[PDB]
Design a protein around this ligand. Structure first.
Ligand SMILES: [Zn+2]
Ligand SMILES: [Zn+2]
Lengths: 1335, 99
RNA sequence: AUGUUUUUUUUUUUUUUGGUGAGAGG
DNA sequence: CCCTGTCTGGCGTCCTCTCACCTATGA
DNA sequence: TCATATTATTACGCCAGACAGGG
């Protein structure tokens, strides 16, 4: 029907072509009758007749002459909705410049006429004059004029002289502004200057000057001359219940503009003096500016009472504009809403739906069914039948329900599992019965929740509800590989009570010929549900190629494990039920069933799990009592020993032996120790309290205490909650953030007294305030993420590359945190992984790594896999099917089409609620040493010291994989060496961080080069020791006579000649920095490893500051080019740093703020990506210095650290694709033979297809540079202005798109959700393939 | 509460809100993102064009349902043409291009 | 075998096809 | 002229339910 | 009833982005 939406400026001829009549009078309506005004705002001739095909006043009351317009009516003759499309125009007496092009920041008329905003407004509000082609006088064109400047000029240049003001003058300036001429000038000005600031100031002005010439937008279209009025139907005038009309705000705005315009026409008729018509035109200017965007000028106008009234731009922008309130989200027919309840008899593809809601939602299907049978005739009869609800429409209703799915939806839908399609089962009742397992997907408890039902009307929507959105199809969460139909709380208690054991019961050690008579012995009353027993089970192992082989054997098991074996499908082994089955074990039971036997046995087995869990939890009778919370007998003596310890510490505090901070630290330490001891006392007293004999002496076992099974099963409860119900509830913290030294020694079974409950209320009010304010940032994070993603659709099958990121296991310094099988599960390898022995093709180079491949990776102990990542995908406008990976909720690769940006953005932002808002190296294991980034030297004693700061100390095992990693500073005492074998727990590293070592490479004698006591260094003989040290001063304390003196130590031989560095001809002089203290004095012979000086010195907003890419306040500074380094100017704002490369060109430098403790010396050579100071590091520096793969590893590690600290499983594909959407823009460095500009920022796919269709020719391409935009700056900088207008500020984006003449080739998800068509991702990707093919 | 078809608002062609007004469910923004997350392109297309806003689409759909033909004739939403007239009522010339 | 053998007004028209603000649940 | 406080604008969660209250003037 | 047309409170918290000031 139509391609792209084009936006441009509105010419006065274009506004007269939209229009149907000039709106003169401001008179709205008659108000005493019902008729409007002829001819006012709500006219007849200008727009249309209120009534359909009627002259409002009187003629044509039938259907013959539609169109005639008599003189007595001055009325058109069409439809009732004809006025909604027709718009009027107000002939503004005095020109008024647009507020969107005068105050957009930056203003469109501000950087175009080369005039400051302040000066532009002055003249615009009749407060300053502006010259326009004066003539032969001493005045510029842009230069303004004041009353005094004009008065004198008026008497001076009375002849050829022009100096107007207001929009009129402004219009002229714009009108008489040769665009083309300015281009060359600006272009020549940019090529004839070197000023950095000017360059950017000139490139931003020429960009908007050449863009205006590229389109059909004129400079004189900025000023509004023929103001357009919105259709009445769109500014509706309805009365509320009563006798008055509740009028809209736009009618106030238009009525004021028309009142003022009529006054201004009458004053220009009457020839009023100058100051009267200046105030009149100024009031018209402010009235127009208030109509368009109210409140952007000084304080907004108001009708009733002090609240400002809502203008047109406030009908567009904001949370309640048209995008976010009526075009992205709509209210919807065939929909319903009610309170949910359980109904556990359901199968997990069906839900209960009440009869009253079912007869209301399915009224047209029932009408169609009733008309088909022949029971009635006309539609009315059917509506009377279902209004009466006779006895025959319920069979009609059960025949329209049967195979027709519905979309259930819980009201805060965060990820895609919050809309699932069921089949209805009709309910006597008024509450939606919802299958319990599905509740863990919706985050739906049953404490008063409500859900909405939606009906797929058409046939393609019924098939999408059955084939994509059915609840049997969503059994794996799309964020990872974990099953989302995990059995939640009652059913794991029923299983944990069923499959367990006790050392004596009915039927101990009897033998049973099958699981059927195991259940028969449980039901008849001859054995117990947990009584250990040899049974004969027949497990089917499918060891052949798709053939199930029976093996039958006698397992020593219990009765309950055989009864649960009657429900397990064929292929799973018996050892999946042989254990005790908590919650992690039943989750991996369903996961192994899904990986082996597929989907249909896993659906039917999930239902049979839920049924048998509910049934035996009912048979269990697992209550909770007051006696179940067993108080430790050792608890009171532990509290008295802690009270004796705080008594000892305070008796030392009365005598002043210890400090106050050490007292507070000792009290918090002994109460933490006593808390841990009380928790261990109660945990022994709960986990093994049952001690029952069997045929003789006693024997112990794990307890059948009720609260212990609710904790050990993982149903509801943890260690901390069961700790607070029996042991002491810790040391609660006051809202100051610091802890309180007197704990809450009473649990909940004993009574809390008053003060302890008040401290508890501190600790809990902080948590409720944190959740109720955290949810806003979590939701706004999901919004920013799905609007930066929004476009990215799997659109190929292979990009045809060999690049991809290097997935290693991540190791922080403790034990290996996340194994390689968690990171390289289901992601397609980049090049073929060599087997760790020698040069073998273990896996090929384009294989998906599912579980079988990952097990053959874990057997061979594969180091790290080079795997394909989304950020390395070469596909223009989308992601190919291999560089994404596995489907994640489907076992296979991602299909051609499935929108991965939206599921990724939801999977990152959905755990936003669970996240929070507000010496030396000791080895642990026993293995082999390896060093990386190492340049070292052996000292005199033997410990290998390091001459490199950035050395990584890895502990490699005997197999080949890397198990530990650490960072060792410059100059540390390593107890070990390279390639060595150590023992578990042996200290291998040592240093002093408070004393920066200035250790050497060679030996010799020490001379004090440029070290003079009195100006350079100072004499501070030590007080308490006597062994003095010449203390080196810094460059700020010494005066300007000797500030140029750099103290240093250079090593010589026994004669005095300079001992050179081994490898060069340069001596090894070390320039001493500020605040140093000389350790080894003059004449002392040195060696390696000996110092030459003493140098003394996060949750959810972290996720936001990583995706939005803020800078930290003190970033780590780096080096943009390798080579030698040196210092510069002495403290003029900053302290300089000059880097001269060995082979490369010199002139790069950087002025470091000198408040940082540096890392580099003067004789040190640096590299790109090498640190100069320490602290956090901004991602833009990673991108422009190290590489794209470096910054994507930086973001995925720095945000999986937050998601792992709070314990959420998210696969890394989602963070890699939001990282792709961050660094999608690029900047040009060398324009080459293309049509770009020098420092123009252009999107990367554009410049790549440009120089890839030019490089296929003879011409060599253009060399770009990638840039990393934060997610809101990157979604507002898009080549599709509806995508950047449905999101944040619409004023800025619509003026930028209007003055650029931008066009929206739709081509994404939200443009097609706005404009009302098929999404180009899902089922509609075939439709968009067809439409893109047929052009 | 449930709604098949009844009265709507004035300015927009979408259904009213509430229970005291016999109105339908606001199919909000995150539900649209959840349908985009699946492949529900046709479910979303009737969810924002036929069931909600487009007047010719919904009258043709009601007659198509009661004839026994589950098929939608979509058209363009009315609130987007309301957007075009509110943007166009500024000094902005927003259009709809070639066939 | 036979019937101009008690005439007088005891009268012709349908149906038609709406913002603002406050509070609660999750 | 390159850092720099300082000022100005622009964000800040979805869905639902109940109730009340709505410009002054004026010969 | 039918045209006439706008004044005497302050009490967010970042976080970019643009601007006059000065070593
Ligand atoms: Zn007429
Ligand atoms: Zn690719």
């Amino acid at each position: 029907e139509f391609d792209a939406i084009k936006i441009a400026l509105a010419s006065p001829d274009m506004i007269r072509s939209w229009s149907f009549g000039e709106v003169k009078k401001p008179e709205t309506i008659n108000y005493r009758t019902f008729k409007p005004e002829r001819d006012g705002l709500f006219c007849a001739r200008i727009f249309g007749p209120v009534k359909d095909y009627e002259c409002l006043c009187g003629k044509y009351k039938r259907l013959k002459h539609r169109g005639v317009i008599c003189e007595k009516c001055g009325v058109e003759v069409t439809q009732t909705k004809v006025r909604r499309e027709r718009m009027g125009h107000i002939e503004l007496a005095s020109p008024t410049a647009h507020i969107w092009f005068l105050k957009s920041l930056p203003s469109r008329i501000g950087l175009l006429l080369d005039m400051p905003l302040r000066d532009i407004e002055r003249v615009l509000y009749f407060e300053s004059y502006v010259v326009i082609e004066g003539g032969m006088t001493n005045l510029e064109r842009q230069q303004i004029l004041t009353e005094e400047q004009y008065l004198d000029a008026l008497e001076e240049f009375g002849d050829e002289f022009d100096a107007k003001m207001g929009a009129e003058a402004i219009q002229a300036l714009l009108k008489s502004m040769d665009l083309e001429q300015e281009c060359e000038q600006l272009r020549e000005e940019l090529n004839e200057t070197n000023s950095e600031t000017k360059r950017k100031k000139l490139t931003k002005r020429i960009k908007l000057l050449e863009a205006f010439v590229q389109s059909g937008n004129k400079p004189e279209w900025m000023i509004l001359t023929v103001l357009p009025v919105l259709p009445p139907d769109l500014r509706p005038l309805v009365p509320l219940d009563g006798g008055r009309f509740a009028t809209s705000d736009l009618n106030d705005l238009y009525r004021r503009v028309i009142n003022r315009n009529n006054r201004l026409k009458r004053l220009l008729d009457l020839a009023a003096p100058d100051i009267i018509v200046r105030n009149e035109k100024r009031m018209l200017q402010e009235a127009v500016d208030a109509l368009l965007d109210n409140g952007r000028r000084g304080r907004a106008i108001t009708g009733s009472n002090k609240r400002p009234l809502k203008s047109l731009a406030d009908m567009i922008k904001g949370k309640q504009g048209r995008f976010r309130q009526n075009l992205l989200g709509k209210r919807v027919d065939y929909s319903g809403r009610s309170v949910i309840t359980v109904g556990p008899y359901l199968r997990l593809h069906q839900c209960g739906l009440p009869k009253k809601m079912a007869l209301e939602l399915f009224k047209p299907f029932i009408y169609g069914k009733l008309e088909l049978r022949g029971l009635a005739t006309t539609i009315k009869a059917a509506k009377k039948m279902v209004e009466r609800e006779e006895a025959v429409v319920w069979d009609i209703l059960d025949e329209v329900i049967r195979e027709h799915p519905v979309l259930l939806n819980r009201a805060p839908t965060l990820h895609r599992l919050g809309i699932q399609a069921f089949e209805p089962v009709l309910i006597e009742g008024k509450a939606i019965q919802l299958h319990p397992l599905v509740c863990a997907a919706y985050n739906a408890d049953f404490d008063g929740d409500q859900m909405a039902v939606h009906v797929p009307l058409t046939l393609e929507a019924q098939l999408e509800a059955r084939a994509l959105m059915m609840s049997t199809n969503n059994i794996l969460s799309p964020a990872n590989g974990e099953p989302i139909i995990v059995p939640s709380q009652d059913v794991v208690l029923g299983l944990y009570y069923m499959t367990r054991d006790c050392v004596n019961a009915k039927g101990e050690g009897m033998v049973l010929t099958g699981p059927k008579e195991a259940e028969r012995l449980y039901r008849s009353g001859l054995a117990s549900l947990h009584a250990r027993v040899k049974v004969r089970i027949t497990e089917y192992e499918k060891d052949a190629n798709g053939e199930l082989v029976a093996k039958t054997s006698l397992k020593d098991t219990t009765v309950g494990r055989a009864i649960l074996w009657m429900i397990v499908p064929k292929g799973l082994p018996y050892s999946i039920v042989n254990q005790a089955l908590g919650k992690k074990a039943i989750s991996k039971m369903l996961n192994t069933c899904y990986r082996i036997l597929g989907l249909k046995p896993t659906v039917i087995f999930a239902d049979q799990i839920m049924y048998t869990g509910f049934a035996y939890a009912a048979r269990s009778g697992a209550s909770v009592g007051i006696d179940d919370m067993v108080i430790p007998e050792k608890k009171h003596e532990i509290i008295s020993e802690a009270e004796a310890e705080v008594a000892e510490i305070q008796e030392q505090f009365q005598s002043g032996l210890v400090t106050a901070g050490e007292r507070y630290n000792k009290v918090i330490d002994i109460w933490a120790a006593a808390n841990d001891r009380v928790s261990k006392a109660m945990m022994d007293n709960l986990q093994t309290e049952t001690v029952i004999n069997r045929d003789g002496q006693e024997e112990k076992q794990v307890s059948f205490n009720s609260i212990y099974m609710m904790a050990d099963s993982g149903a509801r409860g943890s260690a901390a909650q069961i700790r607070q119900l029996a042991g002491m509830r810790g040391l609660m913290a006051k809202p100051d953030g610091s802890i309180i030294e007197t704990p809450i020694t009473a649990n909940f079974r004993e009574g809390l007294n008053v003060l302890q409950y008040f401290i508890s209320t501190h600790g809990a009010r902080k948590g409720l305030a944190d959740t109720a304010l955290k949810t806003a940032n979590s939701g706004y994070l999901t919004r920013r993420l799905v609007d930066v993603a929004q476009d990215l659709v799997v659109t190929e099958d292979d990009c045809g590359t060999h690049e991809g990121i290097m997935m290693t296991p991540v190791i922080e310094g403790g034990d290996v945190k996340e194994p390689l099988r968690d990171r390289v599960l289901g992601r397609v390898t980049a090049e073929d992984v060599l087997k760790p022995g020698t040069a073998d093709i273990l896996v090929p180079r384009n294989t998906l790594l599912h579980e079988q491949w990952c097990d053959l990776l874990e057997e061979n102990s594969v180091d790290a896999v080079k795997v394909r990542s989304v950020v390395s995908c070469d596909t223009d406008f989308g992601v190919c099917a291999h560089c994404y990976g596995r489907d994640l909720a489907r076992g296979h690769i991602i299909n051609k089409g499935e929108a991965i940006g939206v599921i990724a953005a939801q999977s990152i932002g959905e755990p936003g609620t669970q996240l929070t808002m507000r010496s030396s190296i000791q080895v642990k294991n026993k293995g082999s040493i390896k060093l990386s980034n190492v340049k070292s030297v052996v000292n005199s004693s033997g410990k290998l010291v390091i001459t490199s700061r950035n050395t990584e100390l890895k502990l490699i095992d005997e197999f080949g994989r890397t198990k530990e990693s650490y960072k060792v500073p410059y100059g540390a005492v390593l107890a070990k060496g390279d390639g060595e074998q150590v023992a578990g727990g042996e200290t291998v590293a040592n240093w002093d961080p408070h004393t920066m070592p200035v250790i050497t490479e060679v030996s010799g004698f020490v001379r004090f080069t440029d070290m003079i006591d009195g100006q350079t260094i100072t004499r501070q003989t030590d007080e308490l020791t006597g062994l003095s040290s010449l203390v080196v001063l810094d460059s700020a304390e010494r005066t300007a006579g000797g500030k140029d003196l750099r103290p240093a130590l250079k090593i010589v031989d026994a004669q005095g000649n300079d001992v050179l560095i081994p490898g060069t001809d340069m001596p090894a002089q070390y320039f001493l920095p500020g605040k140093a203290i000389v350790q080894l004095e003059d004449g002392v012979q040195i060696s390696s490893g000996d110092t030459l000086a003493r140098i003394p010195q996060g949750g959810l907003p972290r996720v936001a500051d990583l995706f939005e890419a803020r800078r930290p306040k003190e970033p780590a500074i780096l080096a943009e080019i390798s080579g030698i380094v040196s210092f510069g100017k002495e403290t003029k704002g900053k302290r300089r740093l000059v880097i001269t490369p060995v082979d490369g060109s010199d002139p790069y430098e950087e002025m470091i703020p000198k408040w940082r403790q540096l890392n580099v010396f003067e004789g040190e050579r640096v590299e790109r990506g090498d640190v100069i100071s320490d602290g956090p590091e901004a991602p833009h520096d990673i991108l422009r210095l190290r590489g794209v793969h470096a910054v994507t590893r930086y973001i995925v590690n720095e945000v999986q650290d937050v998601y792992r600290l709070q314990g959420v499983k998210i696969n890394d594909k989602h963070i890699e694709v939001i990282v792709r959407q961050m660094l999608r823009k690029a900047t040009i460095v060398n324009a080459g033979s293309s049509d770009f500009l020098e420092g123009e920022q252009v999107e990367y796919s554009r410049v790549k297809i440009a120089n890839r269709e030019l490089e296929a020719n003879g011409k060599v391409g253009a060399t770009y540079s990638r840039d990393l935009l934060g997610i809101t700056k990157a979604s507002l900088a898009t080549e599709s202005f509806i995508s950047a207008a449905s999101f944040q500020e619409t004023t800025r984006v619509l003026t930028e798109a209007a003055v650029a003449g931008k066009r929206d080739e739709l081509r994404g998800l939200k443009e097609n959700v706005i404009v009302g068509r098929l999404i180009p991702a899902g089922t509609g990707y075939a439709y968009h393939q067809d439409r893109m093919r047929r052009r | 509460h449930a709604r098949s078809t009844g009265s709507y608002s004035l300015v927009t062609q979408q259904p009213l809100g509430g229970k005291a007004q016999f109105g339908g469910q606001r199919f909000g923004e995150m539900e649209v993102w959840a349908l985009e997350a699946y492949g529900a392109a046709y479910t979303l297309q009737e969810m924002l064009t036929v069931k909600s806003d487009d007047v010719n689409g919904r009258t043709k759909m009601y007659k198509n349902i009661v004839d026994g033909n589950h098929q939608m004739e979509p058209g363009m939403p009315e609130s987007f043409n309301v957007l075009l007239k509110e943007i166009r009522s500024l000094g902005i010339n927003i259009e709809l291009e070639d066939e």
